[PDB]
Symmetry: C2
Subunit: 433 residues, 2 copies
């Protein structure tokens, strides 16, 4: 453990990205050489905070805050007000270095990922909790940063549900995977960010947004707990017909689900909308739901029971599946548009992503069953060092190194380290919840 | 003819009164409920006959129901939206708006506010007077609608991003994303708003409209266009449309050599190759479609007349979603079974747009052909809401009778055929 953790730690320090001589983040994969992704930095940030290296996190938060658009945007191909970029890079071409933000303006899909701004709020809270000082968050520029994020997420456009309406590929999954609408990942991160925002926002001068947050929280909590929850009992209720959503039983694979679900198993659905229930299991959403207390205690234990009982499906030989099961055949053709990268059990389409192990650890510790994550650590340890920390794995059991997976993927390294740290010291959950 | 005579009688009976003033028309008579999209056809008739007061009243009263402030709470309408419908609460009288706050889908359809802008323009054009539009409350009204539509959220394309069921089709039919109908109406509404907005004080919005129009037009014209050339391109292997993802062999056989149409939707790894009538017709009418494109669309409608018009003009979209695709895309909503309702059902109301587009395109005999087909059945069937089946042979499975926009759509098709200059009201 010590030897592998030290090898991982040495890799992590090499990934540090510098701006004006200061550390401002970590690169996605050490070998662009000057690029930092917000979602990727989370695992790095948390490790650095645990080791008392808070300055890099402060610098990241300060610089990313400056990249946030402050004003309403009415022109096409420009980022929405209050959003946080997916990534930034240090441009040193001109004599003076500066940061260049990417909001997806020239990405294959011209969509600004929503998860980045929500992670940004959680990292701000992590920083002030680690520092035992809310001073940074209380600075007017940071109060504004938080408010703008909450405003864009809270504000109803056409959809009036308490959930956040988004286009497809608007989070960690950034290609077409049928996660348009109300995908779990973003609902859970929205809920988590709402909690953090409420904890950091000064009410004076923020009355309207603080009020809206206070009303949205319990509503969204109840909404997700009621309408997203899948267990054997829910399947029976859908089958036997009032309700908020009309969900028709013919649209779901209910005999396959009944067979898959253990008696005391259950999970939060991938998506819920009018005439729409995505019964895929999504790992990030389900694990963060446990960590954020979004799932009830009973729901949290049902998720753990599912993971334990269907270990081979959900973990296999590499923790863990981003989602389950794979979209296949006609479903694959319709939902992904025959995306060749997301063939069954590859990449986003039920590929295996080592980074998720830190959330598995956090959730397992939170649920009082740390041995679940210990089992996953043992498996990951056996391959990640050998394979030099790949970005992801492919196949039904995650046996194959990802076809386009980068080596020395930083959130694989940090995710592994973070998992080990959360096991040693459960009290560190306070950083992320 | 008794059919035209009966149509006029019904349209009169459909009028909805508020405080003794006509404020719109009911959806179907048999009930105190005026839908914004339904009223367009009626309003255009009333404008054409010089009965402009009802339209003025509709516009004034609906403007009052529009939310003026930003809304951060759930289950309340977004700022600047027009409700799908309103009703008179007789129990003094007051107007009660419906934005979908308690509907089966808690989504405010976007088409209503776009039609509202087009109606406001239709009114000022028919009146030969822009007075009502230049009033401050109306200037605000137009501004708010443009703001909610223009303001980028997560999606940065010039097109409007929406949930599923966000237009005339207000149930789950795989029209989430950038559905044609709303892009075409958005384009037309942008053009209309520019004509009616006073540049002084509204500079940010007017500049934004000017920036968006050519970007939106170019985007739709390039990326939504489907013809044989594009089908071959996909077969050869920007949005990465893969041949396996579309019914290529159906489409290759179906499309006439000189035929073409604007796709139902476009996004990364996504091309909805269904033909949507409202979007394609309004694109011709607004000149969003190029002249060549407009002729290619008309050639398609002529050559595949049996598929697209059949025994009742006309298909809301084509073809139907069936089998596993139906289950995956619609979630097995029993009202949208194949060739019924939104799922490639036949909607009489659409004939007024077929008429308008046909006249615009210089092929008015199409309009005549459609009116002839409709005349044979609509009166005997008592003006049904919609028809079902591959050829539109069945009265709609749950279709209401005396559907007002079936009646108004019928009459408006003839009026536009009689006087092609009336296209100024809608373009």
């Amino acid at each position: 453990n010590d030897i592998i953790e030290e090898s991982a730690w040495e890799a992590l320090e090499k990934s540090i990205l510098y701006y004006k001589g200061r550390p401002v983040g970590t690169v996605a994969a050490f070998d662009n050489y000057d690029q930092c992704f917000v979602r990727d930095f989370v695992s790095s940030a948390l490790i650095f905070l645990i080791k008392g290296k808070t300055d890099i996190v402060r610098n990241f938060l300060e610089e990313t805050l400056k990249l946030q658009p402050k004003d309403r945007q009415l022109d096409a191909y420009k980022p929405g007000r209050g959003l946080i970029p997916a990534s930034f890079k240090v441009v040193s071409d001109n004599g003076e270095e500066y940061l260049e933000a990417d909001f997806g303006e020239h990405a294959i899909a011209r969509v600004t990922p929503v998860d980045s701004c929500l992670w940004w709020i959680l990292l701000l809270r992590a920083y002030v909790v680690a520092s035992k000082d809310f001073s940074l968050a209380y600075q007017p520029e940071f109060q504004t940063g938080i408010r703008l994020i909450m405003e864009i997420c809270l504000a109803n456009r056409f959809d009036m549900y308490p959930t956040l309406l988004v286009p497809d590929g608007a989070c960690m999954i950034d290609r077409r995977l049928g996660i348009y609408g109300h995908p779990l990942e973003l609902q859970v991160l929205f809920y988590a960010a709402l909690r953090a925002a409420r904890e950091m926002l000064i009410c004076q001068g923020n009355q309207d947004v603080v009020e809206a947050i206070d009303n949205r929280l319990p509503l969204l909590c109840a909404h997700i707990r009621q309408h997203y929850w899948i267990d054997i009992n829910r399947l029976n209720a859908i089958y036997r017909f009032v309700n908020l959503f009309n969900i028709y039983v013919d649209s779901i694979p209910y005999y396959e689900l009944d067979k898959w679900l253990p008696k005391k198993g259950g999970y939060l659905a991938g998506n819920v909308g009018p005439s729409q229930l995505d019964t895929r299991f999504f790992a990030l959403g389900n694990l963060m739901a446990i960590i954020s207390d979004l799932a009830t205690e009973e729901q949290s234990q049902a998720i753990m029971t599912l993971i334990e009982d269907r270990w081979e499906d959900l973990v296999g030989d590499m923790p863990m599946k981003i989602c389950y099961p794979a979209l296949e055949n006609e479903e694959y053709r319709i939902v992904t548009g025959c995306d060749p990268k997301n063939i069954p059990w590859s990449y986003h389409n039920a590929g295996s992503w080592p980074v998720l192990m830190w959330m598995l650890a956090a959730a397992s510790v939170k649920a009082g069953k740390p041995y679940i994550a210990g089992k996953a650590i043992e498996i990951a340890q056996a391959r990640l060092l050998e394979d030099e920390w790949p970005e992801y794995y492919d196949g039904k059991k995650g046996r194959l190194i990802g076809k386009q997976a980068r080596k020395y993927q930083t959130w694989t390294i940090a995710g592994f380290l973070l998992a080990a740290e959360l096991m040693k010291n459960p009290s560190l959950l306070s950083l992320i919840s």
